[PDB]
Amino acid sequence: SKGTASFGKRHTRIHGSCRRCGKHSFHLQKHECASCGYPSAKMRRYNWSYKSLRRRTQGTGSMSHMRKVYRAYNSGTLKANARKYLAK
Amino acid sequence: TTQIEKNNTIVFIVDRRASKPEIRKAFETVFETKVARVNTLITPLGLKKAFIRLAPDVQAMDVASKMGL
Amino acid sequence: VKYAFKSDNLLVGKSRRDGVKASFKNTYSTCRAIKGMGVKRAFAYLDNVLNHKEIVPFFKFYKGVGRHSQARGSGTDKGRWPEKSVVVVKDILKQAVSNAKHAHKKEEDELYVISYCVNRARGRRRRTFRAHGRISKYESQPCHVELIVGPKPLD
Amino acid sequence: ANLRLQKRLAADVLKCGKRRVRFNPAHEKYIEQASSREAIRSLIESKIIAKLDIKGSSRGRIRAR
Amino acid sequence: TANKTLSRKLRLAKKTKTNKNIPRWVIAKDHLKKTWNYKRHHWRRSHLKL
RNA sequence: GGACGCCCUGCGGCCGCUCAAAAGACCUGAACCCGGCCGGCCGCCGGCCCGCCGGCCCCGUCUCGAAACACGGACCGAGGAG
RNA sequence: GAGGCCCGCCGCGGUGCUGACGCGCAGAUCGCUCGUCGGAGCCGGGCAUGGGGGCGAAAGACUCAUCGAACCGCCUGGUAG
RNA sequence: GCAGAGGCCCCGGGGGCGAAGGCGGCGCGCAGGCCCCGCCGGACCGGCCUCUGGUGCAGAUCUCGGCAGCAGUAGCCGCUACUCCGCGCCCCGGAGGACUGAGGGGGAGACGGGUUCCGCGGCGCCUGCAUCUGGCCGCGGGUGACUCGGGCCUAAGCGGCGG
RNA sequence: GACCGCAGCAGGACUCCGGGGUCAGCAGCCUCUAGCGCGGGAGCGAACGCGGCUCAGGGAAGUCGGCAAGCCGGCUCCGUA
């Protein structure tokens, strides 16, 4: 009854999917994400686990805009920058 | 194919974002026909499917043949 | 590479089946019995074991096999009637006899079962659920039976 | 072979349970071919498929007591 | 479950849509040798959304 | 990535083929363990033609003292500590 | 036709056999035998209360097989005559 | 003895005319060890001087991998139950004999699962025996609402609010 | 019958609708409808074990202790410290 018999009464979802992190970490009663931190505007990151930090970070995704803008800085965005720095 | 023959109905996979008013208007312009009732479902694979019942005066088999159904 | 018998031009006929889903211990015993047996006598004997009219003497894996009357003159008091083994050992015997008769122009009477080699094979592994939330192995013990029929009367 | 679909369909057409559906032993082939409610219905007219009586309990002894 | 939400149903339908084996022609094109998707899930042994 | 012939109800066997080689679902292929054949009668050390005689407790370990009815150690391979 | 009344079904408990099991069907189950069965009753869903805190008809019980201080990561390869 | 570094190896050390390694067997050394020979193997390998170390295992309830005896052993003893014939399978069809016994081994929903649903084929996996069976595997499909529910209202509660 | 317990696990898991006979009964025991023969089968009929059954004469002498078993029981009418 403390063990297998009470495992039979499990038939609810306490954690749903998170809008920001897409993980089964969004508590549905407390309306907060265990990993994402959502609804907070700052993402929830703790230095005690670097493994969690590695799991969701810059570079674990497309990094689209940043990749293109880093490549552009290496090519011709610095010269365009000089024209607006010269300004009027 | 039976639905075209008996219920004057064409079954069409449509954009999920689309609504029954838009699908009636779209079918009516692209196929140049008249639609009476649209009933739709979102499939277990996530794709909306619309059962387009055509107007009684129109014959669905003629609309289907023109499309290639 | 898979055959263990290296006759020097003895005009033998051979067959082998690999990963045979039958017990290694039961098959070993059935093959051992047909050794030194004329091919025609062996086919009848395997058929008698299938009908439970003759016994396969178990000389190497006998812990749990029961003392039986049909094993009276076998040299052992223990034997059993392996059915899934007899079927397999006969099919390989049938292939071996065809191979010898077709290639070496041999005859069923001329042929005798000169050699055999049944070896252990990797077994399918399933899981038995034990008590107190434990899991244990339920693995098969397959064989690699090789049979060679030969013109020699095993002089 | 499996006449499972035929006995499910026939029970639906004869509005009885699969226990009360009774196929003709002679025609195992004719029924095997049927795969549609309509085909089963044609066989039901042919009396190669029939629903049994509800086999209800006798109430004659009860009436006498 | 029969009373699901479209947003739970659409994330579940992706899994049904992608529980597929590598197309045989893909194995031939890439000389893959390993032909098992390994991301395939069987409803009984699996716990999606867990 | 297995020619051809043969026998298969078939599974599959066989003969061989491609190759320098099967290297055949994979380089080399150990030890443990196992099966066929094939000798032998059984551990170590010493003598001798070699199965007889003579000697011979289970190691590591703490410990006054271990064969200990003290503890750890089924077996084997790799890794394993100034 | 009254009752935190009695017998008794389901239900909800869990007494005894110190029965079975004890490499289980089962990390607590099974069979009988039982306590109660209009009530301080039983049951579902939602919600509230959070770790030296909670909640407790009080047994240091219970808090997801964890409770005389939950669990996870870290400090931490803590220190050991 | 090991693994690397800087040198040397008298026409520029040894190697597909066979490297390392594996397996057996000699020799040499008090021994750590070394050498050679046959076989398997199929591209690398050293002797010596100087140099550097993540440098030698029988033990650690040692780690990880394999795996033995036990052992064809313990077991496959909840839910009364199967039988005959027909391709005859535990499949299906007919005939019997029964069981769950309306708080059902019945018909349906909530939740949780997420395709398990259906038809067709299949047995390689699984179906702790079998299988021609299947919730298994391959292929193709399947959920239609002005009236049902969500959505809407408020409940316990929770969030918002110049601050 | 697909949920949750490592599992196609004698465990749990919320409802709705509820036929006939015997019966006070929705109890027990049989049945219509509906469902359907569960990690298999054959023999044999040892010890012993588990689940039962009966036991002559005695009647708790057994045992820590009547543990276990058995007696008792429905209804009607007397009668009741």
Added chain:
RNA sequence: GAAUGGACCAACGAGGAUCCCACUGUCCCGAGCCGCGCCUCCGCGAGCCUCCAGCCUCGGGAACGGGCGAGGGCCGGCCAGC
């Protein structure tokens, strides 16, 4: 030893005791029976454990040994029980 409540028990109690009637294998003193396991076969098939091994008596010895000293037994392989 007197609301660290004292005395008092109607009604209650899966509470803890003593006796009586009734009853019965609780026993004297066990016996017979029925299913199912067991057992044998077909098909499937594990665990735990393990230095090595597996007959004793006595002696000495970590004072209680399978191995050691000295005697006495012993084909070898298995099964149902225990």
Added chain:
RNA sequence: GAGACCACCCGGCGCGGCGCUCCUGUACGGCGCAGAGCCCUGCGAUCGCCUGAGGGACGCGCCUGCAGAGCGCGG
């Protein structure tokens, strides 16, 4: 007659009949001048007679029936 499996002791087995004997207690059916009564011309639990009947047998004797001794395996 012996048994967990084996082993043992036996071997033209066995089957299913017929007798004997034993068990149980008088079969189904027919008949009746039995039957409390009832109301209609029948019903009726039972009862008596046939009937120490019928049914059963694992025990004993017998065969009026099929049967029954390997061309198995060793040697």
